[PDB]
Amino acid sequence: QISVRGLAGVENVTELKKNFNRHLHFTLVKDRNVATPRDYYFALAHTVRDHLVGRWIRTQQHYYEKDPKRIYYLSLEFYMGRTLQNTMVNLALENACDEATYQLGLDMEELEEIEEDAGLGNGGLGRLAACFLDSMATLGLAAYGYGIRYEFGIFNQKICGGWQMEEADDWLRYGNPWEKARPEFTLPVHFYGRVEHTSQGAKWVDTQVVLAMPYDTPVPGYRNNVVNTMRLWSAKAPNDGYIQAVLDRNLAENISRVLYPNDNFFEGKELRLKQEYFVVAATLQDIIRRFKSSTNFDAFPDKVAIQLNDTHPSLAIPELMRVLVDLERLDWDKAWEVTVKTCAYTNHTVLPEALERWPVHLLETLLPRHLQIIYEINQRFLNRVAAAFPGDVDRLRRMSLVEEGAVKRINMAHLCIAGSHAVNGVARIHSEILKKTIFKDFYELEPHKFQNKTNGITPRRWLVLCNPGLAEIIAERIGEEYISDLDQLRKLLSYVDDEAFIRDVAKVKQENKLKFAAYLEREYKVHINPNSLFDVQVKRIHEYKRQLLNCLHVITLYNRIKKEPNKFVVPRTVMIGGKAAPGYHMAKMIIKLITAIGDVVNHDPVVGDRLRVIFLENYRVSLAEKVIPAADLSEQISTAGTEASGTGNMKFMLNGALTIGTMDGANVEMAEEAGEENFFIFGMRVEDVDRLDQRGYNAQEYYDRIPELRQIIEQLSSGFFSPKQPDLFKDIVNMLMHHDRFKVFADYEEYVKCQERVSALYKNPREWTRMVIRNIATSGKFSSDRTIAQYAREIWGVEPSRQRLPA
């Protein structure tokens, strides 16, 4: 049907059809008379999987022959979403399968909707890991993703009476056709025990053993025949009154049961520590095994790179020391040199409550040897500090891996910097902030460790897969090469005054909005005007992300309409979506506020269809693929200095939404790439936030001087939005007024004014679209292919390659 979706040759369609029928019969044990749509999805999924395996086996064979340096990406999160369409895209089978299933009388799109998301992540950091695997395969790097096969991923979000309810995400219920269990590669992991010192060094004894069983999932590169591996570990009890003993096997296996649903918040629970060691201990054994099948660990850093996605797998550092010192009998100094040269660390936040600071008594019980290695690391590190800054006793306590206080803690971030040859932030402004503030001391010691690697997104999932209409009209004009070289989108700048392109871009957006508006009614009974501006804020719910600022704007628009009902306003559909961590009370209250606003606004006859406020339930990867292409306005409104990067922002820019936001995270590089005139920037810069802090933030001041703001607060306090419980929102008002760490009021005036400028541009469709073209055309930098190429060259020491492997 459309050209980017590949060829539907007669040989391929015929081959796919009979393989579909084979799997339905032999694999699913069904016939056409009893098969449900779910059986058809599986038959298609198995048929597509068949095309992967040949390439998968040869890719692993190739890496064995050639023996290149291997990249190990360690993450506790891999937010993969669905695999079927993505696999088709990267294999050029999309049209072929469309044809083949059409001829069998089935609608492929309907079948795609049946696949469960692999929601093995929380948000940005987990999805970054997913985009990265895609890009690594597309760039032909010998790269492995390592993590945990959670039985339950991020919870499904249900709204009941406007409240979030969490229900277990049981994504393996019907099975996962993509994974291959590899029980033969099972590995022991140790916990508890004690440390013995012998003549021949320390020994870790009396441990409890948990077995780690790997599952391999294929990661196909874009049309290059490269298929890399994602290896996820599952917890299994060893085989050594009776009934209870068997039932107690669940204790060991609980390790891989459930993903912790905190985003940007540290919770010091033991089960989470067990998860962190489990992935690290099994992964490192696997790495060393593969290394030995190529005595001399000098070459280890030439053959191995290990990337740490945040501090979650930071125990890789003392674990590698443990293995090298205790088991391989290398001397400390040589083992340490190997470790530093092998490991690299990526930071994703500067919020102090997000930093992992493990109580020493936990590490002592669970990992007594690792605590000893950490104390030894800390001591030798502090000796370097003392030697470089003699007499500076305060530097010593600031830089320590060990924090003193009520309870002693290990600062895992300090550990990562000391034990890594490179430390990076995830956007330029974030990388600068790390150097100026929380890691200043470390930067002064070792300036050469600190780098920037601005985040990116994969244009395969985030353009071709979710927005074929837009990919097609672009391909019509500039070809297909841009899909793996997103810089080529610049060529689109010479179409900015082209009447045909302007009409096509706008037509694609209209189609996406129509389709999404239909999806809203069919799956969630909600009535929206598709001619309105689609104003969307989707991301995890957090105070720093300031969904509350958005709420205040929405209430302002409503109050303005009610004040002058017969005045013309640009109509809007305001969509806010995202999950709150189950114990984050404030986040839960914000979700409730949003729905309460919708209850009032959406049922006011005076408002008409001019303003609708929708909360998007169960925001997740597959919902993102639908709403992002349909958006006109992307809300990226974090208080300056708090959002490390953002990647949602990039998804919107790539798909033809304009951005309203602060000079925060990657926003800064986006505006810089598109031109500030092509972006809606408002609010305090980082420096303004600092000035406000030194002086003191007094929210009363804004309440006293802005009548429109005062009215909103009075409405909140008095029960306008909660008529049956007048004081339902006292916590929110109280926080806004007395302890807002994120200065919602300080940005309010500028935000509202900037929002008027957006509405004005929207009234002029042609100029709106011309600005969109200028965004799409400069989004090339934000490809994860660029990001990974920089990781590869400046951290890992490997050259990317665009070259095909033989078919």
Ligand X SMILES: O=c1[nH]c(=O)n([C@@H]2O[C@H](CO)[C@@H](O)[C@@](O)(CO)[C@H]2O)cc1F
User: Which 203-222 residues touch a second copy, going by CB under 8 A?
Assistant: 216
Q: Which of 43, 52, 111, 125 binds ligand X (CB under 6 A)?
A: 125
Q: With contacts defined by CB under 6 A, name the span among 4-12, 117-125, 188-196, 469-477 that binds ligand X.
A: 117-125
Q: Pick what 349 binds: ligand X, a second copy, none; C-beta below 5 to 8 Å, kind-dependent.
A: ligand X
Question: Where does residue 191 fall: left (phi above 0), alpha (psi -120 to 50 degrees), or beta otherwise?
Answer: beta
242 binds a second copy (CB under 8 A): yes
Which residue of the set 51, 312, 414, 540 is catalytic?
540
583 binds a second copy (CB under 8 A): yes
664 binds ligand X (CB under 6 A): no
Q: Which of 90, 378, 645, 790 binds ligand X (CB under 6 A)?
A: 645
Q: Are 81 and 117 in contact (CB under 8 A)?
A: yes
- Alpha helices in 219-331, H assignment, sequence order: 242-247, 249-253, 270-292, 300-303, 316-322
- SS3 of 120-168: ECCCHHHHHHHHHHHHHHHCCCCEEEEEECCCECCCEEEEECCEEEEEC
Active site residue 651: yes
d(CA 371, CA 363) in angstroms, rounded, equals 6
Q: How far is CA 36 from CA 39, 144, 222, 229, 728, in A?
A: 5, 36, 32, 31, 46
- Give Cα 324 distance to the centre of its chain: 33
Question: Which amino acid would we find at residue 314?
Answer: S
Question: Which amino acid would we find at residue 66?
Answer: K
63 binds a second copy (CB under 8 A): no
Query: Rounded to a whole number, what is the distance in angstroms from the first to the last CA of the chain?
Result: 25
36 binds a second copy (CB under 8 A): yes
Q: Are 423 and 416 in contact (CB under 8 A)?
A: yes
311 binds ligand X (CB under 6 A): no
Residue stretches of the annotated binding site for AMP:
31, 64, 289-294
Q: How far is CA 391 from CA 388, 396, 455, in A?
A: 9, 9, 40
807 binds a second copy (CB under 8 A): no
Question: Which amino acid would we find at residue 79?
Answer: Y
Sign of the torsion formed by the C-alpha atoms of 703, 707, 710 and 712: negative
Q: Which of 59, 164, 349, 420 binds ligand X (CB under 6 A)?
A: 349
Q: Pick what 665 binds: a second copy, ligand X, none; C-beta below 5 to 8 Å, kind-dependent.
A: ligand X
For residue 103 the two structure tokens come to 């001829």
Q: Which is nearer to a second copy, 30 or 626 (CB)?
A: 30
On the 0-12 / 13-18 / 19+ scale of CB atoms within 10 A, 560 is middle
Q: Which is nearer to a second copy, 148 or 413 (CB)?
A: 148
- CB 272, min distance to a second copy, A: 9
Q: How far is CA 625 from CA 199, 442, 464, 466, in A?
A: 60, 40, 11, 5
Q: What is the dihedral of CA 160, 163, 168, 169, to 10 degrees?
A: 90
Which residue of the set 348, 414, 572, 743 is catalytic?
348
643 binds ligand X (CB under 6 A): yes
173 binds a second copy (CB under 8 A): yes
d(CA 538, CA 549) in angstroms, rounded, equals 14
Q: Which of 11, 66, 243, 296 binds a second copy (CB under 8 A)?
A: 243
Residue stretches of the annotated binding site:
31, 64, 289-294
Count of residues in contact with ligand X, rule CB under 6 A: 18
Q: How far is CA 412 from CA 310, 341, 358, 419, 671, in A?
A: 10, 18, 7, 11, 34
Residue 711 DSSP symbol: H
Q: With contacts defined by CB under 8 A, name the span among 175-183, 595-603, 714-722, 773-781 that binds a second copy.
A: 175-183
Q: Which is nearer to ligand X, 455 or 537 (CB)?
A: 455
- CB 690, min distance to ligand X, A: 20
Which residue of the set 138, 458, 647, 778 is catalytic?
647
568 binds a second copy (CB under 8 A): no
- CB 403, min distance to ligand X, A: 19
Q: With contacts defined by CB under 6 A, name the span among 36-44, 151-159, 637-645, 669-677 that binds ligand X.
A: 637-645
634 binds ligand X (CB under 6 A): no
Q: With contacts defined by CB under 8 A, name the span among 234-242, 424-432, 512-520, 615-623 that binds a second copy.
A: 234-242
Q: Which is nearer to a second copy, 23 or 572 (CB)?
A: 23
| Residue whose entry in the numeric block shows the structure tokens 């009890």 | 237
426 binds ligand X (CB under 6 A): yes
Q: Pick what 249 binds: a second copy, ligand X, none; C-beta below 5 to 8 Å, kind-dependent.
A: a second copy
- CB 78, min distance to ligand X, A: 12
188 binds a second copy (CB under 8 A): no
Q: Pick what 124 binds: ligand X, a second copy, none; C-beta below 5 to 8 Å, kind-dependent.
A: ligand X
- CB 196, min distance to a second copy, A: 26
Count of residues in contact with a second copy, rule CB under 8 A: 49
Nearest to 588 by CA among 31, 18, 159: 159
Q: Pick what 36 binds: ligand X, a second copy, none; C-beta below 5 to 8 Å, kind-dependent.
A: a second copy
Residues 6+ apart with CB under 8 A from 10: none
348 binds ligand X (CB under 6 A): yes
d(CA 745, CA 736) in angstroms, rounded, equals 8
3-state SS, residue 757: helix
Q: Are 217 and 178 in contact (CB under 8 A)?
A: yes
**For residue 424, which phi and psi values (nearest 5 degrees)?**
-130, 145
Q: Are 308 and 346 in contact (CB under 8 A)?
A: yes
User: Which 134-153 residues touch a second copy, going by CB under 8 A?
Assistant: 152
Q: Which of 54, 479, 565, 723 binds a second copy (CB under 8 A)?
A: 54
Q: Which is nearer to ligand X, 79 or 482 (CB)?
A: 79
Q: Which is nearer to a second copy, 37 or 479 (CB)?
A: 37
Axis-axis angle for helices 428-436, 667-674 (nearest 10): 130
Which residue of the set 51, 414, 651, 781 is catalytic?
651
644 binds ligand X (CB under 6 A): yes
Active site residue 540: yes
What is the number of other CB atoms lying within 10 angstroms of the CB of residue 124?
A: 25
Active site residue 647: yes
Q: Which of 109, 110, 163, 183 binds a second copy (CB under 8 A)?
A: 183
What is the number of other CB atoms lying within 10 angstroms of the CB of residue 243?
A: 7
Q: With contacts defined by CB under 6 A, name the span among 110-118, 188-196, 640-648, 672-680 that binds ligand X.
A: 640-648
Q: Which of 179, 263, 625, 747 binds ligand X (CB under 6 A)?
A: 263
Q: With contacts defined by CB under 8 A, name the span among 75-83, 238-246, 428-436, 765-773 that binds a second copy.
A: 238-246
Q: Are 148 and 233 in contact (CB under 8 A)?
A: yes
Nearest to 587 by CA among 182, 44, 163: 163
12 binds ligand X (CB under 6 A): no
170 binds a second copy (CB under 8 A): yes
Residue 763 DSSP symbol: T
760 binds a second copy (CB under 8 A): no
Residue ranges that bind a second copy, judged by CB under 8 A: 25-26, 29-31, 36, 38, 50, 53-54, 56-57, 61, 152, 155-156, 166-168, 170, 173-175, 180-181, 183-184, 216, 236-237, 239-243, 245-247, 249-250, 254, 257-258, 260-261, 269, 271, 582-583
- Which residue ranges make up the site for ligand X (CB under 6 A)? 122-125, 128, 263-264, 348-349, 354, 426, 455, 643-647, 665
Which residue numbers are catalytic? 348, 539-540, 545, 647, 651
